[PDB]
Design a protein around this ligand. Structure first.
Ligand SMILES: *Cc1cc2c(cc1C)nc1c(=O)[nH]c(=O)nc-1n2C[C@H](O)[C@H](O)[C@H](O)COP(=O)(O)OP(=O)(O)OC[C@H]1O[C@@H](n2cnc3c(N)ncnc32)[C@H](O)[C@@H]1O
Ligand SMILES: O=C([O-])c1ccc[nH]1
Ligand SMILES: [Cl-]
Length: 385
């Protein structure tokens, strides 16, 4: 005989943040997760995540990125877990041949963000360890950096539970039963009811949203990252090697400086295997592209960090057709909030989204402008059953 004010299905990056925001307000919340967050089955492991402010995916994300940054600073002061390191983020690519680089620069200009603009040999000179052609240009953002994503979720969870939130782990939600005055979920461990529901199952939204009469194109992608033994005198966070996201002819790559000798971490963002979250192979190296795509980049742009592979991780992106998020109320149920399709670039915003989700669930509205994340926008090609 236990109901709840709000139920969060999927206590990961977005869900746990929401749980923390709700618990802080004394809202009796229940968070249900198929596993035990943080874990290595979803989209939040791999240890680190980049947070950028000058948004190359679109300047409309800036306000949320800035609020998220402030919230990350708040979390740092609230927990013993490490949350953020200001490595700065470097963005580069061939001059005049990168929409990403261009939009990043424009976003920086339009929002009066503090950035450094350099090109060619200036890049190589400032950051020994980086070798780009003379025709390359870049924009460096000194105030953005790296988030320790697993620590973020763990901190949010510990804070939320301490304030009353309940977390039901290793419990997969299998169905939903929504009424105008309440919401109900069904699991093998029991059924639960509340006044409001927040759906944030990550990669699994592409399989379970149909249970909510929603037909939205969502494609999960297998994305790997590798840690490589590197020249610490050049790639360590200690010597200010920055986090980065760059565009080269074959696509977009991202990386992190070596922290305490863990080695430089690199990822190839443009490519990934289309998969099912329930049958995805989470072993690094099973596909020759896993390690080959990464070394091809390192050999050309960061030769000193192309050493032995120290560690590998397999994680998932969940893309929408326009690659913009989905944060909105269910079109037929104002008491249901949806957080989906973060298309590989949503963790940095998770703190902000947690606040947005909490507001939508409790009031049906949010102070933040989330118009570009509308669940009813045509660019999504959504529908119902
Ligand atoms: C994969 C990846 C993503 C990524 C990245 C590097 C890699 C390799 N680097 C990033 C970066 O530098 N900066 C950034 O802003 N984003 C970056 N990303 C993307 C980001 O990690 C993802 O967008 C984010 O983690 C998405 O969060 P979301 O909360 O959607 O996904 P989750 O953390 O996986 O949580 C979902 C949870 O729900 C649970 N679940 C699933 N099914 C069920 C059912 N049936 N019942 C109950 N719970 C369920 C999962 O267990 C999971 O915990
Ligand atoms: O959003 C990002 O900064 C990012 C890096 C890799 C995937 N997403
Ligand atoms: Cl994602």
């Amino acid at each position: 005989s236990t109901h709840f004010d709000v139920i969060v299905v999927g206590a990961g990056s977005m869900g746990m943040a929401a749980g923390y925001q709700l618990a802080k307000q004394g809202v009796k919340t229940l968070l249900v997760d198929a596993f035990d967050p943080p874990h290595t089955n979803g989209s939040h492991h791999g240890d680190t995540r980049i947070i950028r402010h000058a948004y190359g995916e679109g300047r409309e994300y800036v306000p949320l990125a800035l609020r998220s940054q402030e919230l990350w600073y708040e979390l740092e002061k609230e927990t013993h877990h490490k949350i953020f390191t200001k490595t700065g983020v470097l963005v580069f690519g061939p001059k005049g041949e990168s929409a990403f680089v261009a939009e990043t620069m424009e976003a920086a200009k339009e929002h009066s963000l503090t950035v450094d603009l350099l090109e060619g040999d200036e890049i190589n000179k400032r950051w020994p360890g980086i070798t780009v052609p003379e025709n390359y240009n870049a924009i460096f953002e000194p105030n953005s950096g790296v988030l320790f994503s697993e620590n973020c979720i763990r901190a949010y969870r510990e804070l939320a539970e301490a304030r009353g939130a309940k977390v039901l782990t290793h419990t997969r939600v299998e169905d939903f039963d929504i009424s105008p005055d309440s919401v109900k979920i069904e699991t093998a461990n029991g059924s639960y009811t509340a006044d409001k529901l927040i759906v944030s199952m990550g990669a699994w939204n592409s399989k379970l949203l149909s249970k909510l009469n929603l037909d939205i194109p969502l494609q999960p992608y297998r994305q790997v990252v590798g840690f490589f033994e590197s020249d610490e005198s050049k790639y360590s966070n200690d010597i200010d090697f920055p986090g980065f996201m760059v565009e080269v002819p074959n696509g977009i790559y991202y990386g992190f400086p070596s922290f305490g000798g863990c080695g430089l971490k690199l990822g190839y963002n443009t490519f990934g295997q289309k998969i099912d979250p329930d049958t995805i192979n989470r072993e690094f190296g099973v596909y020759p592209e896993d390690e080959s795509n990464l070394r091809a980049f390192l050999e050309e742009y960061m030769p000193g960090a192309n050493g032995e592979l120290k560690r590998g991780a397999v994680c998932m992106y969940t893309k929408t057709l326009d690659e913009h998020f989905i944060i909105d109320l269910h079109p037929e149920h104002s008491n249901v909030v949806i957080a989906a399709g973060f298309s590989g670039h949503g963790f940095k915003f998770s703190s902000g989204v947690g606040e947005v989700l909490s507001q939508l669930a409790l009031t049906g509205k949010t102070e933040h402008d989330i118009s570009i994340f509308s669940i009813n926008r045509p660019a999504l090609k959504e529908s119902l059953q």
